[PDB]
């Protein structure tokens, strides 16, 4: 079905292939299959699933439907030299919530990342979660930071710290890297909890 349907209507297929086999007990086994094709192309271990094709459209929909109940508790809380001390408090207030959100991760969403981790590790012995972590950030946390949907200077402040969030997982803003090296590898312990 993937390569025969015109791209003008891929939304229906992206919806159905996920929303059907999830309930028919193939959900775990399902993602092991179509996610293989984007791996062989690779384009280094940095540009996986990048583009408008039928491997990230399904990914951008699975966590979009499944993430409705997850953000209920996570998003419940709510010359750049003078304004430098006050900046770190929001990042400190949110980073530990992100780290501890691994405990609250549902088992149903654990399998989605477990599949990706095992499939990537089958071919990528190194890390295999750094790209996964960076992608889940830039897809679900970093863009959702400035979202006016769930809880004009607050937007700018949150957008700025989104860059730090990107940089820490990715391994005037340059001096602000002092806090980046504070938890360079602490995030990987939170990363591996789901993929364990």
JSON list of C-alpha atoms in Angstrom, two decimals, residues 17-147:
[
{"chain": "A", "resi": 17, "resn": "UNK", "atom": "CA", "xyz": [-2.22, 1.44, 9.58]},
{"chain": "A", "resi": 18, "resn": "UNK", "atom": "CA", "xyz": [-1.62, 2.59, 13.15]},
{"chain": "A", "resi": 19, "resn": "UNK", "atom": "CA", "xyz": [-5.17, 2.85, 14.49]},
{"chain": "A", "resi": 20, "resn": "UNK", "atom": "CA", "xyz": [-6.07, -0.66, 13.28]},
{"chain": "A", "resi": 21, "resn": "UNK", "atom": "CA", "xyz": [-3.19, -2.96, 14.19]},
{"chain": "A", "resi": 22, "resn": "UNK", "atom": "CA", "xyz": [-2.80, -1.32, 17.60]},
{"chain": "A", "resi": 23, "resn": "UNK", "atom": "CA", "xyz": [-5.99, -3.01, 18.85]},
{"chain": "A", "resi": 24, "resn": "UNK", "atom": "CA", "xyz": [-5.44, -6.28, 16.95]},
{"chain": "A", "resi": 25, "resn": "UNK", "atom": "CA", "xyz": [-2.43, -7.33, 19.09]},
{"chain": "A", "resi": 26, "resn": "UNK", "atom": "CA", "xyz": [0.08, -6.70, 16.26]},
{"chain": "A", "resi": 27, "resn": "UNK", "atom": "CA", "xyz": [0.96, -3.23, 17.57]},
{"chain": "A", "resi": 28, "resn": "UNK", "atom": "CA", "xyz": [4.27, -4.41, 19.02]},
{"chain": "A", "resi": 29, "resn": "UNK", "atom": "CA", "xyz": [5.14, -6.50, 15.97]},
{"chain": "A", "resi": 30, "resn": "UNK", "atom": "CA", "xyz": [3.78, -3.89, 13.54]},
{"chain": "A", "resi": 31, "resn": "UNK", "atom": "CA", "xyz": [6.42, -1.20, 13.96]},
{"chain": "A", "resi": 32, "resn": "UNK", "atom": "CA", "xyz": [9.24, -3.74, 13.53]},
{"chain": "A", "resi": 33, "resn": "UNK", "atom": "CA", "xyz": [8.36, -3.96, 9.82]},
{"chain": "A", "resi": 34, "resn": "UNK", "atom": "CA", "xyz": [7.90, -0.60, 8.10]},
{"chain": "A", "resi": 35, "resn": "UNK", "atom": "CA", "xyz": [10.54, 1.15, 10.22]},
{"chain": "A", "resi": 36, "resn": "UNK", "atom": "CA", "xyz": [13.25, -1.01, 8.65]},
{"chain": "A", "resi": 37, "resn": "UNK", "atom": "CA", "xyz": [13.10, 0.70, 5.25]},
{"chain": "A", "resi": 38, "resn": "UNK", "atom": "CA", "xyz": [14.21, 4.15, 6.44]},
{"chain": "A", "resi": 39, "resn": "UNK", "atom": "CA", "xyz": [17.15, 2.65, 8.36]},
{"chain": "A", "resi": 40, "resn": "UNK", "atom": "CA", "xyz": [19.02, 1.24, 5.35]},
{"chain": "A", "resi": 41, "resn": "UNK", "atom": "CA", "xyz": [19.08, 4.64, 3.65]},
{"chain": "A", "resi": 42, "resn": "UNK", "atom": "CA", "xyz": [20.47, 5.95, 6.95]},
{"chain": "A", "resi": 43, "resn": "UNK", "atom": "CA", "xyz": [21.94, 9.24, 5.69]},
{"chain": "A", "resi": 44, "resn": "UNK", "atom": "CA", "xyz": [24.27, 8.95, 8.70]},
{"chain": "A", "resi": 45, "resn": "UNK", "atom": "CA", "xyz": [22.82, 8.52, 12.20]},
{"chain": "A", "resi": 46, "resn": "UNK", "atom": "CA", "xyz": [21.53, 12.10, 12.14]},
{"chain": "A", "resi": 47, "resn": "UNK", "atom": "CA", "xyz": [18.93, 12.47, 9.34]},
{"chain": "A", "resi": 48, "resn": "UNK", "atom": "CA", "xyz": [16.80, 9.37, 9.90]},
{"chain": "A", "resi": 49, "resn": "UNK", "atom": "CA", "xyz": [13.08, 9.74, 9.13]},
{"chain": "A", "resi": 50, "resn": "UNK", "atom": "CA", "xyz": [13.73, 13.29, 7.86]},
{"chain": "A", "resi": 51, "resn": "UNK", "atom": "CA", "xyz": [11.41, 14.29, 5.02]},
{"chain": "A", "resi": 52, "resn": "UNK", "atom": "CA", "xyz": [7.82, 14.01, 3.85]},
{"chain": "A", "resi": 53, "resn": "UNK", "atom": "CA", "xyz": [7.51, 10.25, 3.34]},
{"chain": "A", "resi": 54, "resn": "UNK", "atom": "CA", "xyz": [5.51, 7.37, 4.78]},
{"chain": "A", "resi": 55, "resn": "UNK", "atom": "CA", "xyz": [7.83, 6.65, 7.70]},
{"chain": "A", "resi": 56, "resn": "UNK", "atom": "CA", "xyz": [7.62, 9.88, 9.73]},
{"chain": "A", "resi": 57, "resn": "UNK", "atom": "CA", "xyz": [4.00, 10.68, 8.83]},
{"chain": "A", "resi": 58, "resn": "UNK", "atom": "CA", "xyz": [3.06, 7.52, 10.74]},
{"chain": "A", "resi": 59, "resn": "UNK", "atom": "CA", "xyz": [5.48, 8.49, 13.52]},
{"chain": "A", "resi": 60, "resn": "UNK", "atom": "CA", "xyz": [4.14, 12.04, 13.77]},
{"chain": "A", "resi": 61, "resn": "UNK", "atom": "CA", "xyz": [0.62, 10.58, 14.15]},
{"chain": "A", "resi": 62, "resn": "UNK", "atom": "CA", "xyz": [1.15, 7.72, 16.62]},
{"chain": "A", "resi": 63, "resn": "UNK", "atom": "CA", "xyz": [2.53, 9.94, 19.39]},
{"chain": "A", "resi": 64, "resn": "UNK", "atom": "CA", "xyz": [0.11, 12.71, 18.39]},
{"chain": "A", "resi": 65, "resn": "UNK", "atom": "CA", "xyz": [-2.93, 10.55, 19.12]},
{"chain": "A", "resi": 66, "resn": "UNK", "atom": "CA", "xyz": [-1.28, 8.68, 22.01]},
{"chain": "A", "resi": 67, "resn": "UNK", "atom": "CA", "xyz": [0.11, 11.84, 23.64]},
{"chain": "A", "resi": 68, "resn": "UNK", "atom": "CA", "xyz": [-3.23, 13.38, 24.63]},
{"chain": "A", "resi": 69, "resn": "UNK", "atom": "CA", "xyz": [-3.34, 11.72, 28.05]},
{"chain": "A", "resi": 70, "resn": "UNK", "atom": "CA", "xyz": [0.42, 12.01, 28.67]},
{"chain": "A", "resi": 71, "resn": "UNK", "atom": "CA", "xyz": [0.54, 15.83, 28.68]},
{"chain": "A", "resi": 72, "resn": "UNK", "atom": "CA", "xyz": [-2.30, 16.12, 31.20]},
{"chain": "A", "resi": 73, "resn": "UNK", "atom": "CA", "xyz": [0.17, 15.87, 34.09]},
{"chain": "A", "resi": 74, "resn": "UNK", "atom": "CA", "xyz": [3.42, 16.88, 32.35]},
{"chain": "A", "resi": 75, "resn": "UNK", "atom": "CA", "xyz": [2.01, 20.19, 31.08]},
{"chain": "A", "resi": 76, "resn": "UNK", "atom": "CA", "xyz": [-0.04, 20.78, 34.24]},
{"chain": "A", "resi": 77, "resn": "UNK", "atom": "CA", "xyz": [2.76, 22.87, 35.81]},
{"chain": "A", "resi": 78, "resn": "UNK", "atom": "CA", "xyz": [3.19, 26.33, 34.30]},
{"chain": "A", "resi": 79, "resn": "UNK", "atom": "CA", "xyz": [23.07, 41.79, 25.59]},
{"chain": "A", "resi": 80, "resn": "UNK", "atom": "CA", "xyz": [21.45, 38.94, 27.53]},
{"chain": "A", "resi": 81, "resn": "UNK", "atom": "CA", "xyz": [23.68, 39.46, 30.57]},
{"chain": "A", "resi": 82, "resn": "UNK", "atom": "CA", "xyz": [21.34, 41.05, 33.12]},
{"chain": "A", "resi": 83, "resn": "UNK", "atom": "CA", "xyz": [18.61, 38.53, 32.22]},
{"chain": "A", "resi": 84, "resn": "UNK", "atom": "CA", "xyz": [20.85, 35.48, 32.60]},
{"chain": "A", "resi": 85, "resn": "UNK", "atom": "CA", "xyz": [20.36, 34.47, 36.24]},
{"chain": "A", "resi": 86, "resn": "UNK", "atom": "CA", "xyz": [16.56, 34.29, 35.93]},
{"chain": "A", "resi": 87, "resn": "UNK", "atom": "CA", "xyz": [16.75, 32.11, 32.81]},
{"chain": "A", "resi": 88, "resn": "UNK", "atom": "CA", "xyz": [18.06, 28.93, 34.45]},
{"chain": "A", "resi": 89, "resn": "UNK", "atom": "CA", "xyz": [15.15, 28.55, 36.90]},
{"chain": "A", "resi": 90, "resn": "UNK", "atom": "CA", "xyz": [12.62, 27.51, 34.25]},
{"chain": "A", "resi": 91, "resn": "UNK", "atom": "CA", "xyz": [15.06, 25.03, 32.72]},
{"chain": "A", "resi": 92, "resn": "UNK", "atom": "CA", "xyz": [15.80, 23.63, 36.19]},
{"chain": "A", "resi": 93, "resn": "UNK", "atom": "CA", "xyz": [12.07, 23.42, 36.99]},
{"chain": "A", "resi": 94, "resn": "UNK", "atom": "CA", "xyz": [11.33, 21.50, 33.77]},
{"chain": "A", "resi": 95, "resn": "UNK", "atom": "CA", "xyz": [14.40, 19.29, 33.29]},
{"chain": "A", "resi": 96, "resn": "UNK", "atom": "CA", "xyz": [13.84, 17.26, 36.45]},
{"chain": "A", "resi": 97, "resn": "UNK", "atom": "CA", "xyz": [10.16, 16.85, 35.58]},
{"chain": "A", "resi": 98, "resn": "UNK", "atom": "CA", "xyz": [11.29, 15.51, 32.20]},
{"chain": "A", "resi": 99, "resn": "UNK", "atom": "CA", "xyz": [13.79, 13.18, 33.89]},
{"chain": "A", "resi": 100, "resn": "UNK", "atom": "CA", "xyz": [11.20, 11.85, 36.36]},
{"chain": "A", "resi": 101, "resn": "UNK", "atom": "CA", "xyz": [8.55, 11.46, 33.64]},
{"chain": "A", "resi": 102, "resn": "UNK", "atom": "CA", "xyz": [10.17, 8.10, 32.83]},
{"chain": "A", "resi": 103, "resn": "UNK", "atom": "CA", "xyz": [8.53, 6.67, 35.95]},
{"chain": "A", "resi": 104, "resn": "UNK", "atom": "CA", "xyz": [5.10, 7.82, 34.72]},
{"chain": "A", "resi": 105, "resn": "UNK", "atom": "CA", "xyz": [5.66, 6.49, 31.19]},
{"chain": "A", "resi": 106, "resn": "UNK", "atom": "CA", "xyz": [2.81, 4.09, 30.33]},
{"chain": "A", "resi": 107, "resn": "UNK", "atom": "CA", "xyz": [3.68, 0.55, 29.21]},
{"chain": "A", "resi": 108, "resn": "UNK", "atom": "CA", "xyz": [1.61, 0.97, 26.04]},
{"chain": "A", "resi": 109, "resn": "UNK", "atom": "CA", "xyz": [3.90, 3.78, 24.87]},
{"chain": "A", "resi": 110, "resn": "UNK", "atom": "CA", "xyz": [6.99, 1.91, 26.09]},
{"chain": "A", "resi": 111, "resn": "UNK", "atom": "CA", "xyz": [6.68, -0.66, 23.31]},
{"chain": "A", "resi": 112, "resn": "UNK", "atom": "CA", "xyz": [6.76, 1.99, 20.58]},
{"chain": "A", "resi": 113, "resn": "UNK", "atom": "CA", "xyz": [10.20, 3.13, 21.70]},
{"chain": "A", "resi": 114, "resn": "UNK", "atom": "CA", "xyz": [11.29, -0.43, 22.56]},
{"chain": "A", "resi": 115, "resn": "UNK", "atom": "CA", "xyz": [10.72, -1.44, 18.93]},
{"chain": "A", "resi": 116, "resn": "UNK", "atom": "CA", "xyz": [12.74, 1.49, 17.60]},
{"chain": "A", "resi": 117, "resn": "UNK", "atom": "CA", "xyz": [15.55, 0.91, 20.09]},
{"chain": "A", "resi": 118, "resn": "UNK", "atom": "CA", "xyz": [15.91, -2.80, 19.33]},
{"chain": "A", "resi": 119, "resn": "UNK", "atom": "CA", "xyz": [15.58, -2.33, 15.55]},
{"chain": "A", "resi": 120, "resn": "UNK", "atom": "CA", "xyz": [18.19, 0.44, 15.48]},
{"chain": "A", "resi": 121, "resn": "UNK", "atom": "CA", "xyz": [20.53, -1.48, 17.81]},
{"chain": "A", "resi": 122, "resn": "UNK", "atom": "CA", "xyz": [20.31, -4.45, 15.44]},
{"chain": "A", "resi": 123, "resn": "UNK", "atom": "CA", "xyz": [22.20, -2.27, 12.93]},
{"chain": "A", "resi": 124, "resn": "UNK", "atom": "CA", "xyz": [23.52, 0.65, 15.06]},
{"chain": "A", "resi": 125, "resn": "UNK", "atom": "CA", "xyz": [25.50, -0.73, 18.03]},
{"chain": "A", "resi": 126, "resn": "UNK", "atom": "CA", "xyz": [26.53, 2.78, 19.09]},
{"chain": "A", "resi": 127, "resn": "UNK", "atom": "CA", "xyz": [24.04, 4.75, 21.21]},
{"chain": "A", "resi": 128, "resn": "UNK", "atom": "CA", "xyz": [20.93, 3.84, 19.16]},
{"chain": "A", "resi": 129, "resn": "UNK", "atom": "CA", "xyz": [18.97, 6.06, 21.57]},
{"chain": "A", "resi": 130, "resn": "UNK", "atom": "CA", "xyz": [20.70, 9.41, 21.11]},
{"chain": "A", "resi": 131, "resn": "UNK", "atom": "CA", "xyz": [18.98, 9.95, 17.78]},
{"chain": "A", "resi": 132, "resn": "UNK", "atom": "CA", "xyz": [15.78, 8.52, 19.29]},
{"chain": "A", "resi": 133, "resn": "UNK", "atom": "CA", "xyz": [15.99, 10.88, 22.25]},
{"chain": "A", "resi": 134, "resn": "UNK", "atom": "CA", "xyz": [16.82, 13.89, 20.11]},
{"chain": "A", "resi": 135, "resn": "UNK", "atom": "CA", "xyz": [13.96, 13.09, 17.73]},
{"chain": "A", "resi": 136, "resn": "UNK", "atom": "CA", "xyz": [11.39, 12.59, 20.48]},
{"chain": "A", "resi": 137, "resn": "UNK", "atom": "CA", "xyz": [12.51, 15.90, 21.97]},
{"chain": "A", "resi": 138, "resn": "UNK", "atom": "CA", "xyz": [12.37, 17.91, 18.73]},
{"chain": "A", "resi": 139, "resn": "UNK", "atom": "CA", "xyz": [9.02, 16.27, 17.91]},
{"chain": "A", "resi": 140, "resn": "UNK", "atom": "CA", "xyz": [7.15, 16.25, 21.23]},
{"chain": "A", "resi": 141, "resn": "UNK", "atom": "CA", "xyz": [8.89, 18.55, 23.76]},
{"chain": "A", "resi": 142, "resn": "UNK", "atom": "CA", "xyz": [10.81, 21.32, 21.97]},
{"chain": "A", "resi": 143, "resn": "UNK", "atom": "CA", "xyz": [7.98, 22.30, 19.55]},
{"chain": "A", "resi": 144, "resn": "UNK", "atom": "CA", "xyz": [5.36, 21.84, 22.27]},
{"chain": "A", "resi": 145, "resn": "UNK", "atom": "CA", "xyz": [7.21, 24.22, 24.61]},
{"chain": "A", "resi": 146, "resn": "UNK", "atom": "CA", "xyz": [5.73, 27.36, 23.05]},
{"chain": "A", "resi": 147, "resn": "UNK", "atom": "CA", "xyz": [2.30, 25.78, 22.49]}
]
